[PDB]
Amino acid sequence: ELNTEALTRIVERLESEIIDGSWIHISYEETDLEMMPFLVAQANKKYPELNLKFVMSVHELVSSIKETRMEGVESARFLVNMGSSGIHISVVDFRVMDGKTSVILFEPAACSAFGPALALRTKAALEREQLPDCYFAMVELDIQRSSSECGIFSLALAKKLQLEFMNLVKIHEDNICERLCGEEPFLPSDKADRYLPVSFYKHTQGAQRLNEYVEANPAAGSSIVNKKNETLYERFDNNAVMLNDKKLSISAHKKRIAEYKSLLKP
Template identity: 50%
Template sequence: MKSQDSKISAYSSPQTSEGVSTPEGVSTNDPTENLAAHLERLSLEKIKNTPFNREELKDIIAGLEQHNADGSWIKNYYDILDFYMMPALVEQANHKYPEMNLKLAMTPDDFARSLKETLENGIKSSRLIVNAQDRGIHFAVVDHQTVEDKTSLVFFEPTSLRDTLPALLASRTQKSIEYYQLPQIHFATAEMNIQRSSSECGMFSLALAKKLYLESAKLERLHKDNVKGVLCEPDTPLSAEKLDTYLPARFYKHVQGRRRLGEYLKLNPEEAHEKVNKKGETLTERFEKNLVTTEGKTVSVSQHRKRATEYKSLMM
């Protein structure tokens, strides 16, 4: 386990998993890389307490948009930038949706303490974005609903639980609840497997948190089954395939794999014609619209574009 004072990097040549990476050269005319180079010299604890200013944010957004336009986003890793911006993004989300009750927990222990406070305040529904800090940066989101005086928690992992860091975060989040001996907790881990890129877990978790709030009425069956103990086997994650049967199409707006999209629509053919945004696009239409070809690969840039949009919201 690394201490919170360990050095971390944000930009590198491609890697296989999210988290710590080896820096490539830093460009002096790219504001996102300049900031990342500065942040990587700080501890995670110091980054949390490092405020940004509007001029700096304007430069960051310009850099992100340039990356999206020229395709260089595929080589870059933005996890440290999202870590830096996440407190402000969560605050902005709560400002837009006052009843969302979204909290940011920088460690699994912080998660348990935040949940305890939430329950003691009598809040029946909330969302918590939780982060792992050792071995790299990784975010996931937990949906909390109270069902018949029992607390249902579903941990949504945007990537695969076969990867070490996501599995570790899920395990530690659950153990933190056990350590604090919170009563009547029904905890389930669900694998979405919609993320293919290496540093978009923060953006996926933020987007999912909003969907969990906006689509909460459609998640009643999920939480009731969790409380009943029929959602999944004890200590066994809910597979992406089974999770697909519970979630509406809007949860898959940013899915990054064509095969994964096909798996969802095969199980939910009625969702194929569902409009998932204000433009009236279906999942397939939106997916195809966000495909770009760069370095000989056809990939979705949806979540990278969403990052720029989220950062822009902080300027308003």
């Protein structure tokens, strides 16, 4: 029941809000949530091996993780709204390897505040489903800094989790062998940079944050990240804006527009 008329009006507002600069203090979470079923359906059609599911609670996630394992599926992703009275959409990567099940929750933003608690909450929720040889880990990325782009980041990462399948074997392997987080509750960002490929950081909202990634991956600076033959750095600049003498990235905001426009295309 996609209301194309309404969506078309929305797309124009998004572009307008970028030009007048009001985008920064507007929340797009509610609209992302509403559009997500269509956006997920769109992603799956584009990538049949993606196996993306949209779940609207932690309970629906862990019970879906149980289902997916039961059906013999070995590779899947989940967009999960973890919030109750609010919206917080994260992405989970699911991978069975050898006999053991790997579940990794990726948080696009930081986790310094209540990271440990939330990680333990989600871990325990999954333990209650009682999956044998099931290992869980939560990963901090700290690449989202904008206020309402959790959905876009998670949707984009979901598709990258598929495309970077082989590059993500190691982090899943270390999760299973319990060599990933160890003593620490979740995986901090600096540790994550050593595991994850360049394509995950295309929408990074912070020049300093990118400098931290390339310090862990020297070649990442001058690596082509798209068909427009622009490097990670070159792309970061080509999707930035000036507001009050501060360089900000509207990459994720532009990605929302791309995602919405694709639903309109026949």
